Design a protein around this ligand. Structure first.
Ligand SMILES: Nc1ncnc2c1ncn2[C@@H]1O[C@H](COP(=O)(O)OP(=O)(O)OP(=O)(O)O)[C@@H](O)[C@H]1O
Ligand SMILES: Nc1ncnc2c1ncn2[C@@H]1O[C@H](COP(=O)(O)OP(=O)(O)OP(=O)(O)O)[C@@H](O)[C@H]1O
Ligand SMILES: Nc1ncnc2c1ncn2[C@@H]1O[C@H](COP(=O)(O)OP(=O)(O)OP(=O)(O)O)[C@@H](O)[C@H]1O
Ligand SMILES: O=C(O)CCC(=O)C(=O)O
Ligand SMILES: O=C(O)CCC(=O)C(=O)O
Ligand SMILES: O=C(O)CCC(=O)C(=O)O
Ligand SMILES: [Cl-]
Ligand SMILES: [Mg+2]
Ligand SMILES: [Mg+2]
Ligand SMILES: [Mg+2]
Lengths: 121, 115, 115
């Protein structure tokens, strides 16, 4: 017995990774056919708030570290494969390896031709 | 809906002033500019040296971001495309991303009046 | 909804350390910082040389991005505004952008627990 009770299909993959994993990540994405990408130099910290460096028996926090931002605007159906590639290639087994954010994209336009939408990705 | 959007455009470094000035002339002034590298669908360019070839797969580009009233987006797309284009692969790409809220730091004004 | 958002704020370079420390003290630590240039609605500043005026239409700024749990957005807006403001045009702007998914690279943990 039971008691009665009361799209664009486009996305932006924004990932922060270590500088020394950029070429590995880029090459795996390229090999898989996910080519269009924008890369930025950034600084960051994750939930641990940076690292501690020692000098003359004293600890000093370094609360921003060099990182690389990659952005790929993609067809929605490609997001999970790209997440997988980024994670597999960026990981090293150490805190600081990176984070991926998925952000909606409502429109894409290629400048040269004014093509719009998924065909412009 | 918020009726605000973010226009994120990647253009050639030599078209930054042209595009910025054209936007300004049309009254679309608030903007954030970043130096980036990138490649589009062709995966870069091929450079020749000493009988060899090398693919340069990230090239200098400029990112402009304008957070704008939604009803201005198409006009801004048109200005960016007209002024960034050169007829050559690599001219750029424009992305439109939703923005839910905007706050001006100095006065704490929020929404479309803070654009 | 995902109940996750991106706080993207542009602030003065000389207010970064103050803002970052206040965010840290409130427990909002994960953050990405970029060097950018920008102008707001006034279109830059005027610099004088030999009694002539010249427009400087992009100035150095700092971008901070925090991807956060939605329930923290208003407090973070408050912190950024209170710490970044100086009473002068140019103090900054905050944008809130939806985030549909977050993944921690090292472990592949996803969602709000990965923030
Ligand atoms: N919530 C967040 N918002 C914005 N940027 C972030 C966030 N979390 C991480 N980042 C960026 O990603 C980079 C790498 O983060 P990191 O790998 O340290 O994340 P984490 O959550 O601390 O995981 P881990 O325990 O593996 O270190 C940071 O230096 C920062 O640039
Ligand atoms: N899908 C994408 N995601 C992220 N960034 C992109 C994407 N496509 C292009 N970009 C960025 O825009 C810049 C210019 O792209 P580009 O003009 O080469 O695009 P394209 O699709 O290859 O078109 P074209 O055939 O005109 O060259 C790239 O170098 C990169 O920074
Ligand atoms: N609509 C916008 N889109 C993108 N970036 C913006 C926008 N408005 C401001 N910015 C960025 O924020 C920075 C600071 O803007 P600013 O504080 O001058 O805003 P404002 O609207 O002109 O307010 P104020 O009257 O207090 O000066 C700019 O230099 C630019 O990097
Ligand atoms: O970024 C690193 O390499 C270590 C620091 C870290 O994991 C963090 O600040 O969250
Ligand atoms: O960016 C360029 O100038 C040429 C290369 C290009 O169009 C691309 O990589 O897609
Ligand atoms: O950014 C500054 O410090 C002053 C200029 C300004 O407020 C603007 O261009 O909107
Ligand atoms: Cl974004
Ligand atoms: Mg960490
Ligand atoms: Mg191209
Ligand atoms: Mg201003």
């Amino acid at each position: 017995s039971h008691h009665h009770h009361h799209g664009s299909h486009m996305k932006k993959v924004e990932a922060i990774i270590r500088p020394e994993r950029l070429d590995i990540v880029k090459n795996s994405l390229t090999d898989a056919g996910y080519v269009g990408m924008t890369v930025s130099e950034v600084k960051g910290r994750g939930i641990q708030g940076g690292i501690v460096e020692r000098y003359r028996g004293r600890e000093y926090t370094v609360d921003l570290l060099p990182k690389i931002k990659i952005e790929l605007v993609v067809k929605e159906e490609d997001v999970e494969k790209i997440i997988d590639i980024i994670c597999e290639n960026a990981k090293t087994g150490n805190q600081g390896d990176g984070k991926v954010f998925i952000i909606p994209v409502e429109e894409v336009v290629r400048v040269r031709t004014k093509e719009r939408g998924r065909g412009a990705i």
